[PDB]
Every structure is written in structure tokens, then in C-alpha cells.
Amino acid sequence: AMTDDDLRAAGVDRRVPEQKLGAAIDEFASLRLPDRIDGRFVDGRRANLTVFDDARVAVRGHARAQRNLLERLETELLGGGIQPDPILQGLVDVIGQGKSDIDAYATIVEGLTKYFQSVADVMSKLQDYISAKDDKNMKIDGGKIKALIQQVIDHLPTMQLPKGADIARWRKELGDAVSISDSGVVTINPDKLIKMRDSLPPDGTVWDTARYQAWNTAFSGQKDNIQNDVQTLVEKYSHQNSNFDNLVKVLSGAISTLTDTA
Amino acid sequence: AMTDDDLRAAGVDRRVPEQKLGAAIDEFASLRLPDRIDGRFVDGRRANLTVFDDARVAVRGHARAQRNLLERLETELLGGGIQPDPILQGLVDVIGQGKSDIDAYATIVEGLTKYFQSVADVMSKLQDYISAKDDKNMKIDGGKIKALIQQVIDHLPTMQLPKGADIARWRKELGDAVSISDSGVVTINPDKLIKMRDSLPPDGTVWDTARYQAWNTAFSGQKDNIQNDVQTLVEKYSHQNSNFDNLVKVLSGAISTLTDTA
Numbered sequence A, B: 001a002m003t004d005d006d007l008r009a010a011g012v013d014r015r016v017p018e019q020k021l022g023a024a025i026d027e028f029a030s031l032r033l034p035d036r037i038d039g040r041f042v043d044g045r046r047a048n049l050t051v052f053d054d055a056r057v058a059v060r061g062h063a064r065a066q067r068n069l070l071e072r073l074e075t076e077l078l079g080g081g082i083q084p085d086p087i088l089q090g091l092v093d094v095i096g097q098g099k100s101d102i103d104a105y106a107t108i109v110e111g112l113t114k115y116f117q118s119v120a121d122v123m124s125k126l127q128d129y130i131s132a133k134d135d136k137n138m139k140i141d142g143g144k145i146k147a148l149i150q151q152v153i154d155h156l157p158t159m160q161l162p163k164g165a166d167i168a169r170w171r172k173e174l175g176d177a178v179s180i181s182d183s184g185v186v187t188i189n190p191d192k193l194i195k196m197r198d199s200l201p202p203d204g205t206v207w208d209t210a211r212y213q214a215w216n217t218a219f220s221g222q223k224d225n226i227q228n229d230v231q232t233l234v235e236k237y238s239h240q241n242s243n244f245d246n247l248v249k250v251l252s253g254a255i256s257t258l259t260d261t262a
Helices: A004-009 A015-030 A050-077 A086-129 A142-154 A167-174 A191-198 A209-260 B004-009 B015-030 B050-077 B086-129 B142-154 B167-174 B191-198 B209-260
Strands: A035-037 A040-042 A130-133 A137-140 A158-160 A178-180 A185-188 A205-208 B035-037 B040-042 B130-133 B137-140 B158-160 B178-180 B185-188 B205-208
Touching (some): A004 A209, A015 A050, A015 A086, A015 A209, A035 A209, A050 A209, A086 A209, A086 B086, A086 B209, A142 A191, A167 A178, A191 A209, A205 A209, A209 B086, B015 B050, B015 B086, B015 B209, B035 B209, B050 B086, B050 B209, B086 B142, B086 B158, B086 B185, B086 B209, B137 B209, B167 B178, B167 B209
Antiparallel strands (some): A035 A040, A178 A185, B035 B040, B130 B137, B137 B205, B178 B185
């Protein structure tokens, strides 16, 4: 494929997973805890977690479509006694790196989106433990909420980079929202979830509105940090998808040129 | 460079070394030993060895020009925290393979042309040892000629392939006019020179024209085999030069596409 319309006709459209990820980000952003505004109790807003499922499905599907297109291009290329022109293997190697990057990013984005989803899930569930008390107070069963948060921390997704992955490069690329082991195991830094957990009072806590709002503001600060981490990684994923499109345009042009000069 | 005129404007013109090699082949082909035709002694024709020098110089110059153009293209290409697009290194790798092939072929063609030259030289020098005897006979100082031939065999050029060279591939590419060691040392098979050497009578040999012509025909058969070996390798070199031109056209197109999509 040489144009964007050509790419879509070959079954690849990066706008699909990128928009579904954007929708998931908007869903996360929309989540709100209960509050008391000028004295009236306002129910929170919980997350429709299926938006996150839709994003995970689209990211998986896009990676499959990308791999399929590379496989077709590779087949096009492959395609004393004069041996096969070395440029053909060279381009196959470039294709192989492309396949690795597709897979890596799909795995990383799947895992991070599952994490993002699980944070949305806990921030929805925990609202059952915040309620109106008296005419001007809030009750927060914070011990129950700590347990919910710890359940998330305990089950954070891990991801395995492709064999041969340049670990130093991936550490730079992903940043410190994750850790990567020397064997390519990517784990999610639990620091924001820990800060959220440690902010909570015990069960049965009764707070005046002002103290509740101070806590909610701190909690939201951590929530917004997690949203920023995911926004950042979705932007990097979008750059990868742009790189893929450019790779295909390069390979298609190469194949065209080699066909004319054949 | 995207067109052939563009390549020549970038300092690369494969026609130059290829034509100088063709001229050397024609010079070799033109060599003829003395003879007696319908009773009259006909001087042989010796080789202008400078034609071979011109070819060696042109092959060296072409390889330099090719490397220089690749170096310029590489510079054009080179050119959390989002890391450099992997396609750039991939194309650099392809360039690196290109540089290796240029060097390898230059070394092989230089050495084989030196060999070819040295055979032309001995086939010229040896004519001093063939002369008219009587009205109908030829005298051949064949021992002196054996010594000249052995001097060539003893000083055949050797060539070293680039480090990392795929030895099995190069053995297939070059064929059995050469041998290649597991360490990439290319040596020239002396079999035709040995057959030429072993065809010769001793010093002072006096032959009737018919016996001389039988010997000359056998000698020429070996000479023509050596010409065919070199013609074959020059054709393979021409294919390499075509591959280089295609490589540049591919890389230029890639750089163009990546510039538009940047």
C-alpha cells in the first residue's frame, strides 16, 4: 500500500484502535466520586468498563492486520551461480523488526489498558463505600476500600517483550510508569495505587464535607496521574502506528522500484 | 539518486569499469601464438597489458564512488522518550551489507584481473621461445616456457573476503575457478595453467607444422577456458553493479517517502 486509503483497503486503519483508546481515556476521565456540593449529596459517576474491552479488542485486531500485511509484503519480496540479491534479505530483516515492534506494542498496550480498566473498576466499586451521613457529613468505609485497591495491586498484569528485545531502548521508550527486567518482563509501577491506598481512613470514618473534599482532591490527583501515564503511552502507541504506516509505504515503494528494475 | 542520469551525476557510472573489463577481455582474446600458415611464418600477437591496468584502476575507482554515495545516503538517514524510528537502523544495516558487497567484489575482481593480466603477460613473453626452424618446422624452447608458467602459478593473487562474509554463498557465487577457505581466503584454481605447463615439450624441440598446430590448439583451448572464467566473473560483477544501482534507487525512494511522512 502506498497511500492511507490503500492501507485501509489492505485492512489496516490505525484510527480504529486509537479512537477506542481515546474513548477509554474519556471514560476514565469521566469517573467521579460522590460529593456534597453546597450541601446536597451528589452521586458519583462509575465507569462503563466495556469501553476498555473495546479498546483492547481493537488493539489486538490492529496488530493482527498489521502482521498480515507485512506477511503479504514479505511474500511479494521472496518473491558459478548468481545468488539472490542481498537487498531482499535486508528488507525481510526490516520486516522482521516490524513484526517484533507490532507484537511488543500490542502486548504492552493490552496490559496497560487492562491495568487502566482495573483502576476504573476499583474506582467504581469503591463508591459503594462512600455515603451521606447526617445533613452535612460523609461516611467512608476506608478499610473496605483499601482491600479493593490492594486486590488491584496484587493482580497487576505483567507483559513479556519479544525475545531479542533491546531492553535499554524499551526502558527509555516506556518510561518509569513501568519497570522492565533484564529478561524483558514488564511490570506496572504500583506507586499511584499505593498512594491512593495509603490516603484512606479506616472503616466507619465520618468526615465533614471540607475534609472529605480534601481527601477526594488528593485521590483525584493520583487518579489523574494514572490517566496521564496512559495518555502518554497511547501517544507513543500512535507514533508506532505511524511508523508502521511509513514502513509499509517504504516497503511498497521498494517493491515497486525492484519490479521496474527486474 | 533515482535515475541512471542521477547516479552518474552522483559520480557513479558502472559502464566505465564494465567497459574497461570488456577491453581487457578483448585484449586477452586477441593474443595469438606464432604459426606457419600455408608455409609462411606468421608472428604472434602479444598483449598490451596496460588495458588490464586500466580495468583494475576503474574497478577500484567505481568501488570508491559507490561507497561514497552510500555514505552520503547513510548520513541523509541518520539524518518516557520516543526512540529513533527502527526503520532508520534497518536501512543502515542494508547499507552496511551494500558496503561489504562493494568491497568484496572489488577485491575479487582486482585479483582475478591481476591473474588474467599475468596470464596475458606470460602468453606474450613465451612467444620469444617459439621460432621458425628450417623451411617447414617450428622450434619451441618448452622448458623455458614451463618456467615462465610456473612463475605465474607461484605468484597467483589471493584475496580476503570482508569479515562476516557468508562463505557458502560466496563459494556458490564465484564457482570453481576459485577456492574459498573457511576464513574467507580466496585463491585461484591453477588447473588451466597446470594443463598449459604440462602440454609443453622440452627445450630445443623441433616440430613439423602439423604437430605444432596440434599443440597450439590444445594450448589455446586452456587459454580460452581462462577467458571464459573471467568473462563469467565479469558478468557476475555487472550483476552486482546493477544490484548497487537498484539499492541506491530503493534507498533514495525510502528517504523521499520518509521525508514526506516527516
